[PDB]
């Protein structure tokens, strides 16, 4: 019993973290097979960031231009390519400690683990949801660039994020593993702002189901609301609309608790309307939208 915001075990990823130095900049890289991936802005400086042209910047550099150290061992760069906002550096050695993996583009509301690493060394692991506005609420400090997010399916590792920068709000932006940014953000040190976010309804409901699964049922009621009637409320409170597809997704959870999706949608409407009056759900003051249905199941 119990429900906690967990993370995937990070060992498999740890094995693939390395340090990349270029000029006066050091950040992390990911080393899979003979490739090491890192943010393209590593080649930037105290000034280029201000307004760079990556292509120019790139060819004034070479394989000697980057120092890649794994553990205490230097590594030989022989190739450099650029893929979107990422850098690909080839190396002489195919990592022995390379696990089954694939690259995926995470979709909003899905969640992943982040292994925060400084200087090629892993510092911590935490769980993160991709916000609707394409940012994540992470804990990152300078030098954390190149840290990645991932999910694990059994043995396989799907990589879904690499860290690039921090927005003015203190939230983070990065790319998938083909260097394509999440959101419209670009790698320039210039004003950029997070769009106004919204709450992930499907996740809040799954969370409610978990709570029921976990014995706090205080927020239930015998009422029911329509799919359109609820959405009207959701709109009012900056919640995302519920759709039939999302209702379908919740079905197993509904079944397990014997709690219709719309009823739960009723309970929510009420909670939205009346608050919690100082009550706790799963030891939580406010509705929590960072667990997917899938997460809830894998934990119950």
């Amino acid at each position: 019993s119990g429900f906690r915001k967990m993370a995937f075990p990070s060992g498999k990823v740890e094995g693939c973290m390395v340090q990349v130095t270029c000029g006066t900049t050091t950040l992390n890289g990911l080393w899979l097979d003979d490739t090491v991936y890192c943010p393209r802005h590593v080649i930037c400086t105290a000034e280029d960031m201000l307004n760079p042209n990556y292509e120019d910047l790139l060819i004034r550099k070479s394989n000697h231009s980057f120092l890649v150290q794994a553990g205490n061992v230097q590594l030989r760069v022989i190739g450099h390519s650029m893929q979107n906002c990422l850098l690909r550096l080839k190396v002489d050695t195919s990592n022995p400690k390379t696990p089954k993996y694939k690259f995926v583009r995470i979709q909003p509301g899905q969640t992943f683990s982040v292994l925060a690493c400084y200087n090629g060394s892993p510092s911590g692991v935490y769980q993160c949801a991709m916000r609707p506005n394409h940012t994540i609420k992470g804990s990152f400090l300078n030098g954390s660039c190149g840290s990645v997010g991932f999910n694990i399916d059994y043995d396989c590792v799907s990589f879904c994020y690499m860290h690039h920068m921090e927005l003015p709000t203190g939230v983070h932006a990065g790319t998938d593993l083909e260097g394509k940014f999440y959101g419209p953000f670009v790698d320039i040190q210039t004003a950029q702002a997070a769009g106004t976010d919204t709450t992930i309804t499907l996740n809040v409901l799954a969370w409610l189901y978990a709570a029921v699964i976990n014995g706090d049922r205080w927020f239930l009621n015998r009422f029911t609301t329509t799919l359109n009637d609820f959405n009207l409320v959701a709109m009012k409170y900056n919640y995302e609309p519920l759709t039939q597809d999302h209702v379908d997704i919740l079905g197993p959870l509904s079944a397990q608790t014997g709690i219709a999706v719309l009823d739960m949608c009723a309970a929510l409407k009420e909670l939205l309307q009346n608050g919690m009056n100082g009550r706790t759900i799963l030891g939580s003051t406010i509705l929590e939208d960072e667990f997917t249905p899938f997460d809830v199941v894998r934990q119950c």
Binding site: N142, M165, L167, P168
Partner: peptide, 5 residues
């Protein structure tokens, strides 16, 4: 503005 990490 955006801060690189």
């Amino acid at each position: 503005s955006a801060v690189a990490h």
